[model samples]
Target: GNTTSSVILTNYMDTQYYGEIGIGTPPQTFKVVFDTGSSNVWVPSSKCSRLYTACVYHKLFDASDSSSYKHNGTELTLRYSTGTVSGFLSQDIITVGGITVTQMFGEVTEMPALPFMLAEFDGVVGMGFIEQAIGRVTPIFDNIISQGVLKEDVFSFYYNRDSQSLGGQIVLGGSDPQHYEGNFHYINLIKTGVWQIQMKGVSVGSSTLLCEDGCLALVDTGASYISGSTSSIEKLMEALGAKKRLFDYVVKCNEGPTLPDISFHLGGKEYTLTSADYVFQESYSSKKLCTLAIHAMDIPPPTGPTWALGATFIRKFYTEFDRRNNRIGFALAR
Candidate 1:
């Protein structure tokens, strides 16, 4: 169902890494997050004062430096379920590591409140599939293939490690059998990388929750952690009758015996997630974790759908960011 004309960015990180978009003329090294879910790139400008703990990047882009930088005097705000960030939009030449493509069709911003800005990076390069599927008019992956640069249309990777363990590869054009060798059970994606999809229900072993069909859900590979509707999560967790709670790095207790086992049903496959995935570290403080991990923050029947599948969830499965095909593929991890 994919078109060969799509230009896909072979994230040197594969799916695990940040799909970092490199910045700098001399390659000053600012690893920005490339997301397919959003249509923008937020990076600290060279003009930002180093005073803010949130602003990072050794070499921030100076709008004053690039003749291509055009400020529309418009400020953009990104509001996620967790937090929000504000910035201005402008144009710039975005190069994805050592690949070749049009430098045009690029969106860069000057943001200061992103979580990553507090971590090791400075900005975000949204490479989500929607903007492409909806006509960003430029598929980063498609451009890569037309250039004749990889083994096949399939790309493979491993992400999120302590010691560069999070660093994966674009696997060029196809699956590098040298790295991945196993039976691949493909999931016919109802949609490519769009933000929303219909999730009929989630199951664990023999248990099922919210089995209603025509359930549209959102699958976000960008979020490092997984979370969803509070009430729904509560129902599922309560059914599992998981451990109550325990101190961080503490011995197990009856209340916190073994947590619940859970699975998400998608494309006719049960993708299982472990107890640790739902359990949190002891940072909940005075608030009960159950209170914190509910399916809905308030009582108003949540915004999206059942769950917002994050990177941790994606890591558990063999996913393909197939730009050539215009659809993502997932297989159980061996």
Candidate 2:
């Protein structure tokens, strides 16, 4: 049997969940998003341009300060949200939870303010499959498995709400039973590069609203909101009496408690999220701003009409990422 370890993950306004991770021999700590959407671990480097806002706001990694740092001159670039980050590959001992592995990761020299400026985390530790890793670099989680750091190659996340600080946790190695109740319902992976599964439909209480014909969805921890087809999202918005204001669909706070539970049909079962689960409350008591966590994001082409079940969904389900089995398991959050 392998030992499981829990890493306390801090929640940031229900938009991003992150935790402290250490790198180097004498572990230099930095907050990072343990993301499942992409497959490349990266931290802002000391070499980042000072003129850019991305580097000034967040903590930067310095290889010269670390004793265990191994350098590789080969450069790589990753582009996101009109911003590009260029960095060289480097290997070091990465410690997540209780497992430690010699991992290769990117030392980002450039970052965009749009993404990194407001981000609470300084880096991202990707958990996607190695196939999606930039420059064929092995994912940190994959290295953990290959190094036999875990008894079973599985990890789980428990996301809590209304917490200003001590938000949730990340369990490495295997799932922690204390965070969930009953047995987990499993969904096999149908797509690579992301944790994708088939979704039967989504419903509003008794009425089936969208995807009656079924659809593909990615259970993304890196995503902030639940996403669906444009047509479907518009219908959902209307059903909730939420009108699009600027970029967000918002409803009056008073209407929140009266809202019906939202259910997602998956694995021949109905997984539900209460109004408190799907609505993000902002501002103080006076004229409370209530935003629907679901947004319109129609993935184009062969992946059109796709749904991304993000923090809004994960907050309700205790999620398990079984690396060995290539399947996702969900249990009601405790």
Candidate 3:
């Protein structure tokens, strides 16, 4: 809730959400899932043998070879939105894109809900904000930020299933000047599991939603679904002229505004999201333009972070959360 920072951009951009570290002589060659949600990278260790067959992402790393890679005997206890990861900790050199960082931190855990489910994943690589680390240390972001690599405080992300950052290059210190063309701006990023920013209101066409003031959105780049407050969604649909297909706590199968597009006026800029952005694969493939908002949790009472910004809002353009300088950047990219 208090404090801030930053990861380096590299060719081998494997996310640690569920990764395995192959700490051989060549260095720690890991297979990690590069996450846009959390900041900091951690990999599962060789000690993890309880769950998935802990081996390698594409290859395998014989942890028994490294002289410095010692098992700290730390009981692995890793948690996420899906479940918890439990294993051990090991020290080693992390090499990505041929660039090796000495004394890197790896979190090895074998648990459920991983990429393979029954099959164990190495660990996770967080790439969101820099405040996630339990201990204070130099992370990838800080390394690049201080080095003066980026041109501005804002960053951008384009998550297309087809070509997702090709080689996993996180523009460190600065962005790749060739790409990322947009008007970057800063906003107050809420310090939580969700990388949301405080917003003024969300509107559809010319009509203003009744619940557009002082609402919070936990902007996420990892999750595929949009969760969070229900009341806020309700107010938005009502004002947008989208007949509420189902209006109740934990409503289901909603067909929202068909034409007049919806735009989120965030403080200064306007982020206009489309109907296609709010539906699931099945519903969307059905070729129906609807305002869909299903409740992820119980509303009005025991709700954590109500508004979760998902790929729906992101798919519209190129978005970036530059945690190094505390700013959010977005550009129209189709």
Candidate 4:
């Protein structure tokens, strides 16, 4: 038997999904991006200098407000593509749904002006491996499992498409069978830094764009767009007749139905995405235009050929993280 908790996820413009989690005693809540790519929980701090724009936009956590807050003077910095955040690590009781665990997290003192200032979410709850966490802080999920709060070291996600009314959800402890149909197709994790897996190939119609010799891929919920090698992304864009406009590639809205299916080969199974799934509506110069979901980003030879499969691919399947088994499972969403 297993004890579980379910949290409702709030979808933001189909770009990101966040959920509410409480930190410290008496449980003050804040919206956090539930990220699977990294492991380190962080929220804006009341002690932060007021000059930062993030402090004004987000709910700040005050250590004084929590009876259970434990202060640690350890300084930390987290870097991202958009910008960097600096903070101090602290220990506090964390509550997700009904489960509570005493864990280490960060209280942000400084943040980027752009991403944090424009975002609605106040913090981030990382669900990746414990080793990937900042300051090597143990992941919250690991704490729950070790404390016997859950019967198993597992969790799952169900994200509905932008057109769907079902919204999204995150289940802790074990997989939710109701959200998916058919047996779960398991995939082994190839790398530990992130949720990396071996991808067989990616193709559009009959043309191959990636992984002629197989490649490593990252399933990143924190990211909003799909990223591939520059040459591969360019090949895909050219094949799809996508025109480059500013930072994005736009396609003819009428061409969606006529476009070929794009397929990804994973663990001997092929997952296909239709043109409607990859081409989406966007506004440019105040006019509606269709944009390609894929983008180009060079992952150097040292970290060569890693595909970033973001929300566009994630929303198409029910994803399960089995920490105990060190593998990921995918099932076609119902």
Candidate 5:
């Protein structure tokens, strides 16, 4: 590991893993989910109206509190699957892990209440490609490389899902051998934007019934579930005996152990995810419930029909986001 430093990510309900960072002059600290699905950094602004419930308990970024906070009021709108947030551009110093740098990000003045209301983190720090960045803002990872803060122009994620200890980590500089059990198998990226790779095939147990003709797949850390076309995801869900509730699927926690393993084939190499990896059991307010870590979102033509290997899949495999070589490497997690 040619390292700058590593940040321990706090796992939240098997859905999110976030880390802490500081912004502005005196550096107001806040917890943020480092997402790889989109490019943009945003924190709830102090100027937010009380009408938007996300501004209350969540840490708000007050520009006036920090003398180094540069003003920029150009409006930017961020659209998510379930919610939309409108904010203005702001420039400030960002401290990640042990390195600090000046960068451009957002100060959301308006946001939804449902997801934000229950969110443990204050903001999102994107590690996605700049091509997807709204307003054409340079990605923070791009800035990190240009500044040469890290020895290698890459980053790695290692997530542990055991209920006893969910201690996950992110190495900003390079891949760490100690975090993985086996060697990595790298896949060439098809798009310079999102981490798109060639998916040769997908299967449940021994049946190679999906994506056999070859398709696109994105390694998205921002997503909580494995996403694909509506038709494809439904097919997979049916095989898992997963019932769709609202957005995700509900599965029987008792059947989790007997569930079949799924695998994605790339370059003729197989990377498998066991039932223990895909079946998420959450002990809600009182009783325990289970959900299948898969979702459906059809991308329009061309990029349409692409699959997303999400955080749930990532937990079983250590992932290396190699920006320098324009590739992604997957290894068995230790």
Candidate 6:
């Protein structure tokens, strides 16, 4: 017997998934990205300047409107590939999918104006462990777990890639087996801070690009594309007959679906992604161009040779995060 809360995720430009959450006393709702890469929940504050286009674009958290709002003067900052966010740590009651979490999150005073102004979601709700939480705060999931609000200490995600009529869902407490087929395979988390696992390798046909022995793979729901080591990505681009145009690895749009399948070895199982699954088809000035979704990044040593597996790989499988067992699970999404 399991009791769970299901939150419908909005598919943003086939790139990211976000859901709505309620905050404060009367419950002011806002769209938020459920991110497994970081451990901080942040929403734009009413204290933000009017000149900040990002803060102005979304509904702000007004302390005066909420009876449960608690203001803390602790300063905080977060950085991303696109931009940075600076704010103060604040406590409030947050409600998601009818499940309530009290005394959690941050109220952002500043944010990347362009990123938020151009994006569909307003804020981010991080699903990482409490150890990695920003401002020494407990994550929302941890709070829910501690409060024994959930029947089981598990959460699952299903990204519907095949259709636009049905959006994705994030099920809290337990997985919705209806969205998946067969048995779920379990993989131990390599690190408690983030959803890190050991990946055997990545290969295309007979050619193996990287992670031959083993490499750390971070499951990042916040990111839109898969990222790999600089050398590894360059090798993969060469194999795909793709050329570098600024930051993107460009290839003929027509050739994308015809390319070989890129297979990733993890948890003693092989997960294969076709060209249509890994290519980012973007409309240029006059023509549509296909780019390999894998990007180049220098993951420093200790965590060196790491790969960031984003929405592209995630959409193919139903992912589960089990905090009680300290493991991640995956099953084929039906």
Q: What TM-score goes with each of the models?
A: 0.69, 0.92, 0.66, 0.92, 0.93, 0.93
Name the lDDT of candidate 6. 0.82
Q: Superposing all C-alpha atoms, what RMSD in Å does each candidate have to the true structure?
A: 6.3, 2.3, 7.0, 2.6, 2.6, 2.3
Candidate 3 global lDDT:
0.48
lDDT of 6 by residue, 23-87 (tens): 99999898998888778898888988878988878889898999998878698887655577888
Give the winner by lDDT: 5
Candidate 3: stretches off by over 4 Å: 1-24, 50-62, 67-73, 114-122, 135-138, 143-155, 161-169, 176-182, 188-195, 204-211, 230-260, 280-306
Number of clashing residue pairs in every model? 38, 0, 45, 0, 1, 0
2 against 3, candidate with superior TM-score: 2
User: Against the unseen true structure, what C-alpha lDDT does each candidate score?
Assistant: 0.48, 0.82, 0.48, 0.80, 0.83, 0.82
Q: Compared with the true structure, what per-residue lDDT tens digits does model 4 show for residues 175-234?
A: 778889899999988865568789998898877666779987777777667778778788
lDDT of 1: 0.48
Decide which is better by TM-score, 2 or 6: 6
Model 5, range 236-287, lDDT digits (tens) per residue? 8888777788877776667667778899997568888888788775533224
Query: Where does candidate 1 have its weakest 10-residue lDDT segment?
Result: 1-10
TM-score-wise, the better of 3 and 6 is: 6
The TM-score of predicted model 1 comes to: 0.69
CA lDDT of 260 in candidate 6?
85
Using alpha carbons, what is the TM-score of model 4?
A: 0.92
For model 1, how does the per-residue alpha-carbon lDDT over 46-108 read when each residue is reduced to its tens digit?
Answer: 655566445544456666655544454345565545455555555555556465344323222
**Model 2 alpha-carbon miss at residue 97, Å:** 1.1
Q: Candidate 1, which segments miss by more than 4 Å at Cα? A: 1-20, 49-52, 56-59, 63-75, 104-117, 130-139, 142-157, 160-167, 178-181, 192-198, 212-214, 240-257, 276-303
User: Would you give me the overall lDDT of model 5?
Assistant: 0.83
